Design a protein around this motif. Structure first.
Motif, PDB file in Angstrom:
ATOM      1  N   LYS A  72      -4.039  -2.197 -30.557  1.00  0.00           N
ATOM      2  CA  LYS A  72      -4.625  -2.155 -31.878  1.00  0.00           C
ATOM      3  C   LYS A  72      -3.736  -2.408 -33.104  1.00  0.00           C
ATOM      4  O   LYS A  72      -4.218  -2.362 -34.232  1.00  0.00           O
ATOM      5  N   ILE A  73      -2.452  -2.655 -32.924  1.00  0.00           N
ATOM      6  CA  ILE A  73      -1.627  -2.930 -34.098  1.00  0.00           C
ATOM      7  C   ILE A  73      -1.833  -4.417 -34.483  1.00  0.00           C
ATOM      8  O   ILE A  73      -1.410  -5.318 -33.752  1.00  0.00           O
ATOM      9  N   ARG A  74      -2.495  -4.664 -35.616  1.00  0.00           N
ATOM     10  CA  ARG A  74      -2.803  -6.028 -36.058  1.00  0.00           C
ATOM     11  C   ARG A  74      -1.572  -6.915 -36.173  1.00  0.00           C
ATOM     12  O   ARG A  74      -1.560  -8.043 -35.667  1.00  0.00           O
ATOM     13  N   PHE A  75      -0.547  -6.403 -36.845  1.00  0.00           N
ATOM     14  CA  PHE A  75       0.708  -7.135 -37.045  1.00  0.00           C
ATOM     15  C   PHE A  75       1.882  -6.248 -36.579  1.00  0.00           C
ATOM     16  O   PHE A  75       2.402  -5.425 -37.352  1.00  0.00           O
ATOM     17  N   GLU A 113       2.827  -8.662 -43.439  1.00  0.00           N
ATOM     18  CA  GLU A 113       1.809  -9.696 -43.438  1.00  0.00           C
ATOM     19  C   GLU A 113       0.417  -9.172 -43.768  1.00  0.00           C
ATOM     20  O   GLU A 113      -0.323  -9.815 -44.493  1.00  0.00           O
ATOM     21  N   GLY A 114       0.056  -8.009 -43.235  1.00  0.00           N
ATOM     22  CA  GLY A 114      -1.246  -7.428 -43.550  1.00  0.00           C
ATOM     23  C   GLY A 114      -1.339  -7.065 -45.025  1.00  0.00           C
ATOM     24  O   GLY A 114      -2.357  -7.294 -45.677  1.00  0.00           O
ATOM     25  N   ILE A 135      -5.745   4.180 -33.330  1.00  0.00           N
ATOM     26  CA  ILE A 135      -4.723   4.516 -32.355  1.00  0.00           C
ATOM     27  C   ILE A 135      -4.471   6.010 -32.448  1.00  0.00           C
ATOM     28  O   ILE A 135      -3.809   6.459 -33.380  1.00  0.00           O
ATOM     29  N   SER A 180      -7.671  -4.278 -42.226  1.00  0.00           N
ATOM     30  CA  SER A 180      -7.297  -4.536 -40.830  1.00  0.00           C
ATOM     31  C   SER A 180      -6.284  -3.569 -40.204  1.00  0.00           C
ATOM     32  O   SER A 180      -6.119  -3.572 -38.979  1.00  0.00           O
ATOM     33  N   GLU A 181      -5.613  -2.763 -41.025  1.00  0.00           N
ATOM     34  CA  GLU A 181      -4.632  -1.837 -40.481  1.00  0.00           C
ATOM     35  C   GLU A 181      -4.791  -0.418 -41.050  1.00  0.00           C
ATOM     36  O   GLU A 181      -5.909  -0.023 -41.321  1.00  0.00           O
ATOM     37  N   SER A 198       1.927  -3.371 -42.270  1.00  0.00           N
ATOM     38  CA  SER A 198       2.837  -4.499 -42.094  1.00  0.00           C
ATOM     39  C   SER A 198       2.977  -5.349 -43.332  1.00  0.00           C
ATOM     40  O   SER A 198       2.155  -5.291 -44.253  1.00  0.00           O
ATOM     41  N   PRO A 230      -0.139   2.223 -38.980  1.00  0.00           N
ATOM     42  CA  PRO A 230       0.671   1.012 -39.187  1.00  0.00           C
ATOM     43  C   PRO A 230       0.404   0.332 -40.538  1.00  0.00           C
ATOM     44  O   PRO A 230      -0.723   0.347 -41.041  1.00  0.00           O
ATOM     45  N   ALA A 286      -6.695   1.694 -37.613  1.00  0.00           N
ATOM     46  CA  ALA A 286      -6.398   0.935 -36.399  1.00  0.00           C
ATOM     47  C   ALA A 286      -7.060   1.610 -35.158  1.00  0.00           C
ATOM     48  O   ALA A 286      -7.330   0.949 -34.148  1.00  0.00           O
TER      49      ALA A 286
END
Ligand SMILES: [Mg+2]
Ligand SMILES: [Mg+2]
Lengths: 416, 416
Positions: A187-190, B204-205, B163, B156-157, B202, B200, B161
């Motif tokens: 599940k970690i997108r990036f 990029e996200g 998790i 998206s994160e 990131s 998470p 996520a």
């Protein structure tokens, strides 16, 4: 280096026996001045509290204030990099009850929140933030008087644990590798250039917070306890908190199903009142406090949601600068100004001392000195109704008399 | 089982070329009816949208609606346990633009939010929630008209996520062992009976979300972009988001320091306007939107904070039931009713269709059919000002004419 703390000649240390405070008529109370405007608000608080105490007990009781350090002043006293001396932690635990002005944490040295540090180091697991409206306070909402809540915010776990690793760091990579490879996480997108934080929520951390919330509702004859969480997305932390909170109500307080659920009724063993235990999803709750504030009372929630909720509620009653707060644990308690340090105004005697003064009200009440505490609330109510206030209020109203910080403390006394 | 979806005889599929939508005059638009009151609001939306389109383009353009499934109705169509068919994901991506009523996720089967599922499966990384006041809307605040913001919530994160591991589960123990033993973690207050969640964030996200926010401010000549985060506690996720957002403003949009920082100014390459890029800590922001709403415009934030912020803002403008929302990615977009399914009223034709109708307004605008979109906004404004509204509004006002859900859709049309 030797302690720079001076223990008051006259004054006696509060003790705790069987989970109950034993307060002398001459208690020694440690206080942290606070950075920035703490320099303005603390003196006003010391004066107001001494007056309330003098007035309520006719000189029979008197607090022996003892200054202790944390923050910028601490580096000034104990030296470079001593932002939170071990002795301050020792002294708060030893003397049981203390109060502090606002504090700020330096940036650039990888130092985490000093306020959070105090809370966690001393295991002050309850962040208690009561929010009510004071008649006459300029408010952004139409009916602030409908707001009368008490927030029990869990203070020892949640993402506030401070467990995280920087993007691209070797540890973050190590953690992510473990997650994807050993835990099978997909599940970690990036996964690259990815920061990672850990959010813990335990049965014991949750139950001790909710237990305190239900006992408070019973002790104060409140109408309900609302479990606020985002358990529909975070099933094992936030949803667990909600589940464990209702389970505790059932196991320890005889909570029983209302209608078809999910709410429970807990009977007040002293008033026979039935206290409702319910729950609201966190985003919806931020809407409910504005739209149906009269339906909420005592709130029990996790650390981060409580940080948000207490801020949102204080703003709506016009209390952003006069919101009281306490951090309470099983062995000691630390009351605190809940606003920032506002360095631009520091030393000018202009900011609102109402927050630290109402935190002192909570402190006195905690010590069982409720008459003194009632005098402060009475003084705060008359000064504000008198429209004799500091600039932050005055600027929002018409027909107000502008007072300095120090003068507003006097106004509170003049109104006791 | 064969697809139960019927592709419209007349109608053409929207295509995307060089990141730009190519919309025929007869686009096929997939729509999910929605559970509960979706049964009431979707028909009203279909009718209102067709009217706006008919009126704006004199019959030259026409949407060919195609019903697709997700939720309870999907189990009804495709069978037990088919809550989100693969074909729905395929169809949304294929047809590029779609709209949906409210959806609810069943409990007891370990199924995660279907709304979040759609967002993540389709990589619709922008949750776009504009919040403005409609004159005549009964609001809990004194000056709702000062609120005019656009929320870009990362979709998206963050902790969304999904998790996490259940307290006492073997995996949770496995994860905690790893943390304490291999990562040297000592910050978990209660490692036993402890649920664990992973958060998470990131580079990029974060940058693709903030890039979209800044482009939107430029494209719409907005005044500022505010990065909302709790980076003072969550340094590597929330603080990273703030850092990466300002870095992107500097690297890709020529942002430059204002005064001594930390704010930046980005020049609008089309109006020469200087867009302010700033940031506010999340708890304080929930106070600022109430106290100084006029100072905020476009907001860029992480998933969870955006969930809270969009809810808080909608409530304050009296828009809890008429708040539009869109989930946008690089290949497709899904517009949505943003309220719940309210099963108690379902099928009664009584709830407010305003949310899904204003989401349709955003949809039309996204398709470049701005004249049709302007007609819906105009209709919504006149109906509400006319005080010809559904019960949720009517009950809060005096002198209102109560309308059914279907009748309010007509009122919107009558006001175009
Ligand atoms: Mg806070
Ligand atoms: Mg939400």
């Amino acid at each position: 280096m030797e302690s720079k703390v001076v223990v008051p000649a006259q004054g006696k240390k509060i003790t705790l026996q069987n989970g109950k405070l034993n307060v002398p008529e001459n208690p020694i109370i440690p206080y942290i001045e606070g950075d920035g405007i703490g320099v303005d608000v603390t003196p006003a608080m010391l004066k107001v509290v001494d007056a309330a105490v003098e007035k309520a007990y006719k000189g029979e009781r008197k607090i022996s204030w003892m200054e202790i350090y944390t923050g910028e002043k601490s580096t000034q006293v104990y030296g470079q990099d001593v932002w939170l001396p071990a002795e301050t932690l020792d002294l708060i635990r030893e003397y049981r009850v203390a109060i502090k002005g606002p504090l700020t944490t330096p940036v650039g040295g990888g130092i985490r929140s000093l306020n959070v540090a105090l809370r966690q180091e001393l295991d002050l697991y309850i962040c208690l933030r009561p929010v009510r409206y004071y008649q006459g306070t300029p408010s952004p909402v139409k009916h602030p008087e409908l707001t009368d809540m008490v927030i029990f915010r869990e203070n020892s776990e949640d993402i506030y644990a401070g467990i995280e690793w920087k993007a691209d760091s070797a540890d973050a990579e190590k953690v992510i590798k473990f997650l994807r490879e050993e835990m099978g996480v997909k599940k970690i997108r990036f996964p690259e250039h990815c920061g990672i934080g850990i959010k813990p929520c335990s049965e014991e951390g949750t139950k001790r917070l909710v237990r305190a919330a239900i006992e408070y509702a019973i002790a104060n004859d409140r109408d309900s306890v609302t479990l606020v969480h985002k358990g529909n997305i975070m099933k094992f932390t936030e949803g667990a908190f909600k589940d464990w909170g209702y389970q505790l109500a059932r196991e320890e307080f005889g909570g029983e199903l209302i209608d078809g659920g999910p709410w429970l009724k807990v009977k007040n063993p002293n008033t026979g009142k039935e206290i409702v235990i319910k729950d609201v999803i966190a985003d919806a709750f931020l809407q409910q406090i504005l739209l149906r504030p009269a339906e909420y009372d005592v709130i029990a929630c996790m650390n981060l949601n409580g940080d948000y909720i207490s801020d949102a509620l204080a703003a709506q009653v016009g209390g952003i600068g006069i919101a009281p707060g306490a951090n309470i644990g099983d062995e000691c308690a630390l009351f605190e100004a809940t606003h920032g340090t506002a360095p631009k105004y520091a030393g000018q005697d202009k900011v609102n001392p109402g927050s630290i003064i109402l935190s002192a009200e909570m402190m006195l009440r905690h010590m069982g000195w409720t008459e003194a505490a009632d005098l402060i609330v009475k003084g705060m109510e008359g000064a504000i109704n008198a429209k004799t206030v500091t600039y932050d209020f005055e600027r929002l109203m018409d027909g107000a008399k502008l007072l300095k910080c120090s003068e507003f403390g006097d106004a509170i006394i003049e109104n006791m």
